[PDB]
Amino acid sequence: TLRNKFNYNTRECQTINPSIRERGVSTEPPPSDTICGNITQWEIFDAYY
Amino acid sequence: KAVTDMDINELRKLMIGKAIINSSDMQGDLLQEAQDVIQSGIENNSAPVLNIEAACKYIKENLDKKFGPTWQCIIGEGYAYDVTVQNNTLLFMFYNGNLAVLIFKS
């Protein structure tokens, strides 16, 4: 009888939580290519000429 | 006169500032920045007698600060090489006379 609606008030409180999610990310560097260059005096002169 | 008068010894003596590009694989905007820096650096470190090691040391230091940590450039009178490089990271340009310059980003 001592406990009363005005005497005791019960309130339910919860904290907002973001939904857990699972994501997969893959990173792969730019493609690299092999280059072979041969330089000769005549070839340099020909471009220059 | 003209081309007939001109000789290989005469052509080299007549123009030392002529720039010739043989192979391009890097973006053009990037090439413009690199071409100005390499030409200025080689002339400054050319000294009384051109030093291959001296030119490479100046170019290697400038390129590392300019773009990426690991940048390799090799210049020689004549050479044969196979190099694996990243896309748009290699520029090949040879200066007038017996001077071949190779610069690539690894």
mmCIF file of C-alpha atoms in Angstrom:
data_model
loop_
_atom_site.group_PDB
_atom_site.id
_atom_site.type_symbol
_atom_site.label_atom_id
_atom_site.label_comp_id
_atom_site.label_asym_id
_atom_site.label_seq_id
_atom_site.Cartn_x
_atom_site.Cartn_y
_atom_site.Cartn_z
ATOM 1 C CA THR A 1 0.000 0.000 0.000
ATOM 2 C CA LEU A 2 2.930 2.388 0.768
ATOM 3 C CA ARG A 3 4.117 2.117 -2.880
ATOM 4 C CA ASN A 4 1.926 4.412 -5.070
ATOM 5 C CA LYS A 5 1.812 5.347 -8.796
ATOM 6 C CA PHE A 6 2.784 8.932 -7.818
ATOM 7 C CA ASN A 7 5.068 7.505 -5.053
ATOM 8 C CA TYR A 8 7.077 5.229 -7.436
ATOM 9 C CA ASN A 9 7.460 5.907 -11.206
ATOM 10 C CA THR A 10 9.180 3.354 -13.522
ATOM 11 C CA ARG A 11 10.704 4.574 -16.848
ATOM 12 C CA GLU A 12 12.461 2.304 -19.410
ATOM 13 C CA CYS A 13 15.530 3.913 -21.102
ATOM 14 C CA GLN A 14 17.663 2.384 -23.928
ATOM 15 C CA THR A 15 20.706 3.703 -25.893
ATOM 16 C CA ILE A 16 20.564 3.810 -29.741
ATOM 17 C CA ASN A 17 23.034 1.230 -31.183
ATOM 18 C CA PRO A 18 24.050 1.122 -34.907
ATOM 19 C CA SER A 19 23.319 -2.311 -36.498
ATOM 20 C CA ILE A 20 26.534 -4.412 -36.861
ATOM 21 C CA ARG A 21 27.435 -5.026 -40.554
ATOM 22 C CA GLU A 22 30.068 -7.236 -42.288
ATOM 23 C CA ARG A 23 31.814 -5.894 -45.449
ATOM 24 C CA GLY A 24 34.826 -7.216 -47.432
ATOM 25 C CA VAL A 25 37.181 -4.784 -49.261
ATOM 26 C CA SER A 26 40.024 -5.927 -51.605
ATOM 27 C CA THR A 27 42.767 -3.508 -52.837
ATOM 28 C CA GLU A 28 45.162 -4.416 -55.673
ATOM 29 C CA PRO A 29 47.861 -2.011 -57.042
ATOM 30 C CA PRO A 30 47.980 -0.747 -60.655
ATOM 31 C CA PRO A 31 49.197 -3.276 -63.240
ATOM 32 C CA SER A 32 52.902 -3.048 -63.957
ATOM 33 C CA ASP A 33 54.511 -3.904 -67.288
ATOM 34 C CA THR A 34 58.072 -4.878 -68.291
ATOM 35 C CA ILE A 35 59.785 -2.426 -70.729
ATOM 36 C CA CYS A 36 63.122 -3.024 -72.561
ATOM 37 C CA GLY A 37 64.898 -0.017 -74.165
ATOM 38 C CA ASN A 38 68.155 -0.060 -76.204
ATOM 39 C CA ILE A 39 69.806 3.329 -77.008
ATOM 40 C CA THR A 40 72.567 3.760 -79.661
ATOM 41 C CA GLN A 41 74.417 6.900 -80.902
ATOM 42 C CA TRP A 42 72.965 6.511 -84.450
ATOM 43 C CA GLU A 43 69.373 6.069 -83.110
ATOM 44 C CA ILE A 44 69.744 9.196 -80.883
ATOM 45 C CA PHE A 45 71.201 11.110 -83.885
ATOM 46 C CA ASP A 46 68.388 9.874 -86.204
ATOM 47 C CA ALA A 47 65.657 11.230 -83.857
ATOM 48 C CA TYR A 48 67.731 14.448 -83.418
ATOM 49 C CA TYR A 49 68.224 14.696 -87.232
ATOM 50 C CA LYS B 1 73.962 24.395 -97.777
ATOM 51 C CA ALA B 2 71.131 23.359 -95.354
ATOM 52 C CA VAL B 3 71.136 19.573 -94.565
ATOM 53 C CA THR B 4 73.974 18.836 -97.075
ATOM 54 C CA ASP B 5 76.227 21.518 -95.455
ATOM 55 C CA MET B 6 75.352 20.148 -91.963
ATOM 56 C CA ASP B 7 77.630 17.333 -90.628
ATOM 57 C CA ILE B 8 77.245 15.071 -87.536
ATOM 58 C CA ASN B 9 80.109 16.983 -85.807
ATOM 59 C CA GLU B 10 78.594 20.288 -87.095
ATOM 60 C CA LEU B 11 75.029 19.393 -85.922
ATOM 61 C CA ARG B 12 76.200 18.536 -82.357
ATOM 62 C CA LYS B 13 78.274 21.781 -82.157
ATOM 63 C CA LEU B 14 75.476 23.944 -83.707
ATOM 64 C CA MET B 15 72.752 22.951 -81.174
ATOM 65 C CA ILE B 16 73.305 21.689 -77.565
ATOM 66 C CA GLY B 17 69.827 22.713 -76.268
ATOM 67 C CA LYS B 18 67.803 20.539 -78.715
ATOM 68 C CA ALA B 19 65.475 18.105 -76.845
ATOM 69 C CA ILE B 20 64.377 14.778 -78.479
ATOM 70 C CA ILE B 21 61.856 12.303 -76.910
ATOM 71 C CA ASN B 22 62.097 8.668 -78.167
ATOM 72 C CA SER B 23 59.702 6.742 -75.840
ATOM 73 C CA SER B 24 56.727 8.116 -73.813
ATOM 74 C CA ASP B 25 54.674 5.938 -71.380
ATOM 75 C CA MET B 26 53.974 8.545 -68.625
ATOM 76 C CA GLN B 27 51.104 11.128 -68.548
ATOM 77 C CA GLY B 28 51.994 14.299 -70.535
ATOM 78 C CA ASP B 29 51.384 16.724 -67.621
ATOM 79 C CA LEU B 30 53.813 14.644 -65.454
ATOM 80 C CA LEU B 31 56.377 14.544 -68.341
ATOM 81 C CA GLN B 32 56.447 18.383 -68.618
ATOM 82 C CA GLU B 33 57.471 18.752 -64.923
ATOM 83 C CA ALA B 34 60.112 15.957 -65.241
ATOM 84 C CA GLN B 35 61.599 17.233 -68.562
ATOM 85 C CA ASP B 36 62.227 20.787 -67.229
ATOM 86 C CA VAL B 37 63.874 19.442 -64.003
ATOM 87 C CA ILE B 38 66.177 16.884 -65.763
ATOM 88 C CA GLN B 39 67.456 19.375 -68.415
ATOM 89 C CA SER B 40 68.196 22.080 -65.773
ATOM 90 C CA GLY B 41 69.825 19.584 -63.356
ATOM 91 C CA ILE B 42 72.161 17.939 -65.933
ATOM 92 C CA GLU B 43 73.491 21.334 -67.185
ATOM 93 C CA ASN B 44 74.107 22.551 -63.575
ATOM 94 C CA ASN B 45 76.003 19.333 -62.601
ATOM 95 C CA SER B 46 77.642 18.958 -66.068
ATOM 96 C CA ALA B 47 80.736 20.888 -64.745
ATOM 97 C CA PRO B 48 84.046 20.933 -66.750
ATOM 98 C CA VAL B 49 83.570 17.247 -67.800
ATOM 99 C CA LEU B 50 80.094 15.590 -67.659
ATOM 100 C CA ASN B 51 79.809 12.992 -64.824
ATOM 101 C CA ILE B 52 77.236 10.152 -65.246
ATOM 102 C CA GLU B 53 77.221 9.527 -61.442
ATOM 103 C CA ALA B 54 76.874 13.281 -60.667
ATOM 104 C CA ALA B 55 73.861 13.731 -63.018
ATOM 105 C CA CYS B 56 72.087 10.610 -61.626
ATOM 106 C CA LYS B 57 72.602 11.615 -57.945
ATOM 107 C CA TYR B 58 70.981 15.064 -58.512
ATOM 108 C CA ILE B 59 68.123 13.540 -60.613
ATOM 109 C CA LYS B 60 67.496 10.703 -58.087
ATOM 110 C CA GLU B 61 67.236 13.139 -55.111
ATOM 111 C CA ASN B 62 64.947 15.600 -57.004
ATOM 112 C CA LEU B 63 62.615 12.817 -58.302
ATOM 113 C CA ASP B 64 62.223 11.133 -54.863
ATOM 114 C CA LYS B 65 61.037 14.421 -53.245
ATOM 115 C CA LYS B 66 58.968 15.355 -56.370
ATOM 116 C CA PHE B 67 56.810 12.186 -56.702
ATOM 117 C CA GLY B 68 57.525 8.866 -54.900
ATOM 118 C CA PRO B 69 60.049 7.367 -52.402
ATOM 119 C CA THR B 70 61.524 4.746 -54.822
ATOM 120 C CA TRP B 71 62.412 6.365 -58.214
ATOM 121 C CA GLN B 72 65.221 4.913 -60.424
ATOM 122 C CA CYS B 73 66.733 6.736 -63.476
ATOM 123 C CA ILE B 74 69.827 5.499 -65.444
ATOM 124 C CA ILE B 75 71.754 7.505 -68.127
ATOM 125 C CA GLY B 76 74.448 5.912 -70.373
ATOM 126 C CA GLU B 77 76.042 6.377 -73.834
ATOM 127 C CA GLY B 78 74.611 2.988 -74.961
ATOM 128 C CA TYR B 79 72.789 0.198 -73.064
ATOM 129 C CA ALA B 80 70.309 -2.733 -73.286
ATOM 130 C CA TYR B 81 67.878 -3.227 -70.351
ATOM 131 C CA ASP B 82 64.614 -5.009 -69.367
ATOM 132 C CA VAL B 83 62.641 -3.079 -66.679
ATOM 133 C CA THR B 84 59.278 -3.873 -64.971
ATOM 134 C CA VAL B 85 57.508 -0.589 -63.992
ATOM 135 C CA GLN B 86 54.023 0.575 -62.808
ATOM 136 C CA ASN B 87 51.512 1.981 -65.370
ATOM 137 C CA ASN B 88 52.380 5.579 -66.495
ATOM 138 C CA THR B 89 55.576 5.591 -64.335
ATOM 139 C CA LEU B 90 58.240 5.339 -67.116
ATOM 140 C CA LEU B 91 59.497 8.212 -69.366
ATOM 141 C CA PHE B 92 62.322 7.707 -71.935
ATOM 142 C CA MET B 93 64.028 10.784 -73.508
ATOM 143 C CA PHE B 94 67.575 11.060 -74.990
ATOM 144 C CA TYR B 95 69.467 14.427 -75.107
ATOM 145 C CA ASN B 96 71.169 15.659 -78.343
ATOM 146 C CA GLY B 97 74.500 13.830 -78.892
ATOM 147 C CA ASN B 98 75.545 10.497 -77.293
ATOM 148 C CA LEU B 99 73.361 10.875 -74.134
ATOM 149 C CA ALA B 100 70.541 8.363 -73.374
ATOM 150 C CA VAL B 101 68.366 9.031 -70.257
ATOM 151 C CA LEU B 102 65.951 6.473 -68.714
ATOM 152 C CA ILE B 103 63.699 7.478 -65.746
ATOM 153 C CA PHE B 104 61.056 5.139 -64.215
ATOM 154 C CA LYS B 105 59.029 4.865 -60.951
ATOM 155 C CA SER B 106 59.090 1.556 -58.977
#
